[PDB]
Short mmCIF file of C-alpha atoms and ligand atoms in Angstrom, two decimals:
data_model
loop_
_atom_site.label_atom_id
_atom_site.label_comp_id
_atom_site.label_asym_id
_atom_site.label_seq_id
_atom_site.Cartn_x
_atom_site.Cartn_y
_atom_site.Cartn_z
CA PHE A 1 3.42 -9.21 3.49
CA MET A 2 5.94 -8.13 0.78
CA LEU A 3 9.52 -7.08 1.23
CA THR A 4 11.10 -4.32 -0.83
CA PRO A 5 13.08 -6.09 -3.52
CA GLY A 6 16.75 -6.46 -2.68
CA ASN A 7 15.82 -6.67 0.99
CA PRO A 8 17.19 -3.37 2.10
CA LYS A 9 17.35 -3.09 5.93
CA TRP A 10 18.93 -0.77 8.43
CA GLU A 11 22.00 -2.48 9.86
CA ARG A 12 21.30 -0.38 12.94
CA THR A 13 18.47 -0.29 15.45
CA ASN A 14 18.39 3.16 17.14
CA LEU A 15 17.48 5.49 14.27
CA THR A 16 16.85 9.22 14.46
CA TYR A 17 14.21 11.18 12.62
CA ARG A 18 13.75 14.88 11.89
CA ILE A 19 10.55 16.75 11.00
CA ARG A 20 11.83 19.43 8.56
CA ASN A 21 8.51 21.35 8.22
CA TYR A 22 4.87 21.13 9.15
CA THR A 23 1.46 21.36 7.65
CA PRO A 24 -0.71 24.35 8.69
CA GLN A 25 -3.88 22.22 8.63
CA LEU A 26 -2.78 20.88 12.00
CA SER A 27 -0.90 22.32 14.93
CA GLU A 28 2.77 21.44 15.25
CA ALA A 29 2.01 19.41 18.37
CA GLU A 30 -0.61 17.27 16.64
CA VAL A 31 1.76 16.77 13.69
CA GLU A 32 4.56 15.77 16.08
CA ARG A 33 2.15 13.49 17.90
CA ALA A 34 1.01 11.73 14.70
CA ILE A 35 4.62 10.99 13.75
CA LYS A 36 5.63 9.78 17.19
CA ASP A 37 2.72 7.41 17.56
CA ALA A 38 3.32 6.22 13.98
CA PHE A 39 6.97 5.33 14.70
CA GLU A 40 5.85 3.51 17.93
CA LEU A 41 3.60 0.87 16.22
CA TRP A 42 6.62 -0.50 14.44
CA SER A 43 8.75 -0.03 17.53
CA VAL A 44 6.56 -2.25 19.77
CA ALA A 45 6.82 -5.05 17.22
CA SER A 46 10.55 -4.98 16.43
CA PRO A 47 13.94 -4.19 18.08
CA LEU A 48 13.97 -0.64 16.57
CA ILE A 49 14.08 2.46 18.77
CA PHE A 50 13.34 5.92 17.33
CA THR A 51 14.89 9.13 18.51
CA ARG A 52 13.87 12.60 17.45
CA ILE A 53 16.40 15.35 16.74
CA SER A 54 15.33 18.96 16.27
CA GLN A 55 18.06 19.62 13.70
CA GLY A 56 21.16 18.10 12.17
CA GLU A 57 21.46 14.97 10.08
CA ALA A 58 18.80 12.43 11.10
CA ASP A 59 18.49 9.01 9.49
CA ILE A 60 14.93 9.59 8.44
CA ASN A 61 13.92 13.10 7.42
CA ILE A 62 10.22 13.96 7.27
CA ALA A 63 8.79 16.73 5.13
CA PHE A 64 5.67 18.01 3.39
CA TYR A 65 6.36 19.13 -0.19
CA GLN A 66 4.50 20.25 -3.34
CA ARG A 67 4.57 18.91 -6.97
CA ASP A 68 8.29 18.97 -7.92
CA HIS A 69 10.53 18.86 -4.89
CA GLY A 70 13.98 17.82 -5.87
CA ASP A 71 13.65 14.03 -5.99
CA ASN A 72 12.31 13.14 -9.49
CA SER A 73 8.94 11.97 -8.19
CA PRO A 74 6.74 15.02 -8.11
CA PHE A 75 3.60 14.85 -6.09
CA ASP A 76 0.31 15.36 -7.96
CA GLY A 77 -1.83 17.89 -6.10
CA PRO A 78 -5.01 16.96 -4.14
CA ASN A 79 -5.84 13.21 -3.75
CA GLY A 80 -4.04 10.68 -5.91
CA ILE A 81 -0.66 10.05 -4.32
CA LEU A 82 -0.66 11.04 -0.68
CA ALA A 83 3.06 10.44 0.18
CA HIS A 84 6.06 8.26 -0.58
CA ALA A 85 9.20 6.98 1.13
CA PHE A 86 12.68 5.78 0.37
CA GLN A 87 13.87 2.34 1.27
CA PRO A 88 16.67 1.99 3.89
CA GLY A 89 19.96 3.61 3.04
CA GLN A 90 22.24 6.54 3.63
CA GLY A 91 21.17 9.88 2.24
CA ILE A 92 17.63 10.30 0.89
CA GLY A 93 17.25 6.66 2.03
CA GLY A 94 14.72 6.17 4.77
CA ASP A 95 13.17 9.56 3.97
CA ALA A 96 9.39 10.06 3.95
CA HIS A 97 7.72 12.95 1.94
CA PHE A 98 4.04 13.88 2.34
CA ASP A 99 2.02 15.79 -0.28
CA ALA A 100 1.57 19.34 1.13
CA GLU A 101 -1.57 19.78 -1.05
CA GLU A 102 -3.57 17.15 0.82
CA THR A 103 -6.05 17.79 3.60
CA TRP A 104 -4.21 16.32 6.63
CA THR A 105 -6.28 15.52 9.69
CA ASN A 106 -6.37 13.65 12.91
CA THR A 107 -10.03 12.49 12.65
CA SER A 108 -11.90 10.22 10.21
CA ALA A 109 -12.13 12.90 7.49
CA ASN A 110 -9.62 12.26 4.73
CA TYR A 111 -6.72 12.19 5.31
CA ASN A 112 -5.49 11.05 8.72
CA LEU A 113 -1.76 11.88 9.07
CA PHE A 114 -1.11 9.06 11.57
CA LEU A 115 -2.39 6.18 9.40
CA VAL A 116 -0.57 7.60 6.38
CA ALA A 117 2.72 8.19 8.28
CA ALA A 118 2.70 4.71 9.81
CA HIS A 119 2.29 3.46 6.19
CA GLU A 120 5.23 5.51 4.86
CA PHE A 121 7.43 4.33 7.77
CA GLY A 122 7.14 0.69 6.72
CA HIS A 123 8.64 1.59 3.32
CA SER A 124 11.44 3.59 5.09
CA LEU A 125 12.02 0.38 7.14
CA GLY A 126 12.17 -1.90 4.07
CA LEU A 127 8.60 -3.21 3.52
CA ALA A 128 6.82 -3.06 0.15
CA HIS A 129 3.01 -3.15 -0.30
CA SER A 130 1.05 -6.18 0.97
CA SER A 131 -1.85 -7.86 -0.84
CA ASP A 132 -3.66 -8.42 2.43
CA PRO A 133 -6.44 -5.75 2.45
CA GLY A 134 -6.35 -5.74 6.22
CA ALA A 135 -2.63 -4.90 6.42
CA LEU A 136 -1.49 -1.29 6.99
CA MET A 137 0.90 -1.87 4.14
CA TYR A 138 -1.99 -2.24 1.60
CA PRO A 139 -1.53 -0.01 -1.52
CA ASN A 140 -4.62 2.14 -1.02
CA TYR A 141 -5.76 4.25 1.95
CA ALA A 142 -8.58 3.31 4.35
CA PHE A 143 -9.53 4.80 7.74
CA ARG A 144 -9.33 2.60 10.85
CA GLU A 145 -10.00 3.80 14.41
CA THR A 146 -6.71 5.35 15.60
CA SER A 147 -7.40 6.00 19.28
CA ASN A 148 -5.94 2.75 20.57
CA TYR A 149 -4.45 1.54 17.33
CA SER A 150 -2.06 -1.37 16.78
CA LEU A 151 -0.30 -3.02 13.86
CA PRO A 152 -2.20 -5.67 11.88
CA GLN A 153 -0.77 -9.21 12.09
CA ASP A 154 0.50 -9.21 8.50
CA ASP A 155 2.66 -6.14 9.25
CA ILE A 156 4.05 -7.68 12.46
CA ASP A 157 5.01 -10.71 10.30
CA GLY A 158 6.75 -8.29 7.92
CA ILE A 159 9.10 -6.30 10.23
CA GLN A 160 9.67 -9.56 12.14
CA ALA A 161 10.84 -11.17 8.91
CA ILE A 162 13.25 -8.29 8.44
CA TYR A 163 14.48 -7.42 11.91
CA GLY A 164 13.19 -10.03 14.25
CA1 LIG B 201 -1.64 14.16 -4.04
CA1 LIG B 202 17.84 9.42 5.22
ZN1 LIG B 203 9.73 13.14 -2.52
ZN1 LIG B 204 2.88 2.77 0.02
#
């Protein structure tokens, strides 16, 4: 596994998240379900608890944006970069942005919002990319059955190394 340089970590364990907007490819429910299940993989392997707020200042804000979107790291249209996240911190820290131009799905067709969100959430929690091709934290996307999905061992090792 690989930790974000500088080892940034949340000095807190109950963190809140907020879904600022949705993608019209999927229903709101399915979007909300992908995010919830994505936060839970990490949750069952660490002491972190995740609470959703409908509005207000959450620790981790989630949003789908296009090209330029205020943070100096414009997305690039279809394919290529799918999403990105900010390491732990106050402010934009912890935030996860998804490319609004992608095809978001909840099947095997590219892309599956759950596998990508669970990936972004590791970064928001302080993990960098892993060189283990089987880890969720691998640089490039790959579909894995999601129905009864759980965190690969290399990723468990990773949040464990950070949070215990
Ligand atoms: Ca893209
Ligand atoms: Ca934040
Ligand atoms: Zn962004
Ligand atoms: Zn990544």
